[PDB]
Write an enzyme that holds these catalytic residues in place. Sequence first.
Site, PDB file in Angstrom:
ATOM      1  N   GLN A  60       0.873  -1.176   0.000  1.00  0.00           N
ATOM      2  CA  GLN A  60       0.000   0.000   0.000  1.00  0.00           C
ATOM      3  C   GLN A  60       0.921   1.239   0.000  1.00  0.00           C
ATOM      4  O   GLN A  60       1.436   1.655   1.034  1.00  0.00           O
ATOM      5  CB  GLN A  60      -0.942  -0.046   1.200  1.00  0.00           C
ATOM      6  CG  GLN A  60      -1.616  -1.401   1.307  1.00  0.00           C
ATOM      7  CD  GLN A  60      -2.584  -1.548   2.467  1.00  0.00           C
ATOM      8  OE1 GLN A  60      -2.190  -1.620   3.634  1.00  0.00           O
ATOM      9  NE2 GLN A  60      -3.865  -1.656   2.145  1.00  0.00           N
ATOM     10  N   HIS A  88       6.363   3.944   6.002  1.00  0.00           N
ATOM     11  CA  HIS A  88       7.592   3.237   5.731  1.00  0.00           C
ATOM     12  C   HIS A  88       7.152   2.243   4.670  1.00  0.00           C
ATOM     13  O   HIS A  88       6.121   1.581   4.864  1.00  0.00           O
ATOM     14  CB  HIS A  88       8.037   2.503   7.014  1.00  0.00           C
ATOM     15  CG  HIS A  88       9.398   1.878   6.917  1.00  0.00           C
ATOM     16  ND1 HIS A  88      10.422   2.181   7.787  1.00  0.00           N
ATOM     17  CD2 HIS A  88       9.908   0.977   6.047  1.00  0.00           C
ATOM     18  CE1 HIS A  88      11.503   1.507   7.455  1.00  0.00           C
ATOM     19  NE2 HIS A  88      11.217   0.772   6.400  1.00  0.00           N
ATOM     20  N   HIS A 147       6.615  -1.046   2.858  1.00  0.00           N
ATOM     21  CA  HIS A 147       6.701  -2.409   3.285  1.00  0.00           C
ATOM     22  C   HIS A 147       5.739  -3.220   2.464  1.00  0.00           C
ATOM     23  O   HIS A 147       4.685  -2.722   2.036  1.00  0.00           O
ATOM     24  CB  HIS A 147       6.443  -2.578   4.786  1.00  0.00           C
ATOM     25  CG  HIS A 147       5.091  -2.084   5.247  1.00  0.00           C
ATOM     26  ND1 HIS A 147       4.828  -0.754   5.495  1.00  0.00           N
ATOM     27  CD2 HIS A 147       3.960  -2.751   5.522  1.00  0.00           C
ATOM     28  CE1 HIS A 147       3.582  -0.632   5.911  1.00  0.00           C
ATOM     29  NE2 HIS A 147       3.041  -1.818   5.933  1.00  0.00           N
ATOM     30  N   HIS A 207       3.247  -6.599   2.319  1.00  0.00           N
ATOM     31  CA  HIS A 207       2.529  -7.549   3.154  1.00  0.00           C
ATOM     32  C   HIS A 207       2.637  -8.859   2.412  1.00  0.00           C
ATOM     33  O   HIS A 207       2.405  -8.882   1.211  1.00  0.00           O
ATOM     34  CB  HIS A 207       1.040  -7.207   3.275  1.00  0.00           C
ATOM     35  CG  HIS A 207       0.777  -5.881   3.888  1.00  0.00           C
ATOM     36  ND1 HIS A 207       0.674  -5.697   5.249  1.00  0.00           N
ATOM     37  CD2 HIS A 207       0.647  -4.659   3.332  1.00  0.00           C
ATOM     38  CE1 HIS A 207       0.494  -4.418   5.508  1.00  0.00           C
ATOM     39  NE2 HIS A 207       0.473  -3.761   4.355  1.00  0.00           N
TER      40      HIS A 207
END
Lengths: 130, 130
Positions: free
Chosen positions: A82, A93, A95, A97
């Site tokens: 996202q 930050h 990242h 999933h």
Amino acid sequence: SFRFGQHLIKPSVVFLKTELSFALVNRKPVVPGHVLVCPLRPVERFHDLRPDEVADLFQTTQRVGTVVEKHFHGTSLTFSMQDGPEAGQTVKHVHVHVLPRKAGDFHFPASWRSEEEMAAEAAALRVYFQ
Amino acid sequence: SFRFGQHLIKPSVVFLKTELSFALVNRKPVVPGHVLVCPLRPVERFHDLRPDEVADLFQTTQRVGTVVEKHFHGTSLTFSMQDGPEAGQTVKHVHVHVLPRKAGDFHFPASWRSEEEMAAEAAALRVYFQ
Ligand SMILES: OC[C@H]1O[C@](O)(CO)[C@@H](O)[C@@H]1O
Ligand SMILES: OC[C@H]1O[C@](O)(CO)[C@@H](O)[C@@H]1O
């Protein structure tokens, strides 16, 4: 010892660290084995990463996905990033999933668990990267 | 001229090609600017890609996202890879969905458009990679 936005992640919940990335387990995983892979450098948007970090982020994500899919018994994986406020980003930050998936799976309370249970889960995950 | 599972993609709808990846526009994009980035080599699962292809796939995805976000006026991006049958994969070729996002956007009929409209859209996208 690891940075994830404005909170420090204890190394006990981190199961893999590379020259440029790290992977950690979640407090409230949406499905068993929902983990995160993030660049060590705390950048807000995907476009801020250097080619170096991009490759490393995703090579690590491929390694982690293979492991969590194996450990939590999934038959597929959903990878998702996202990127930005309108994408759903909550912590600033980048990242990824990583969520193991299986047939019929569908996709402070809920899936909540203790820090020790997170540390236990991370320790089981470290075994696959030995 | 490009392979995407068991169908050939005409180069007219392809707006970027690298040594290892390519990006194409969709027939029925879920949001304006929903594009795909795929490895040139037709592999079924993410784990089948070589480190080489993984880095390239995602470096290309970063470049494409920056462009589509710019062109279609989004303020964020959603990147997603449905890896496997239980993840939602329909075509057996790894690919990343790149969807520009904006506030309030929510996320043969529908969003359907002609091949020429797809070719027009791809041509506008090629301009940003000149
Ligand atoms: O969390 C996944 C793990 O939990 C079990 O179902 C219980 O031990 C295992 O077979 C698997 O490795
Ligand atoms: O498809 C996105 C494009 O369409 C417009 O809204 C119409 O030209 C543009 O400003 C943008 O570049």
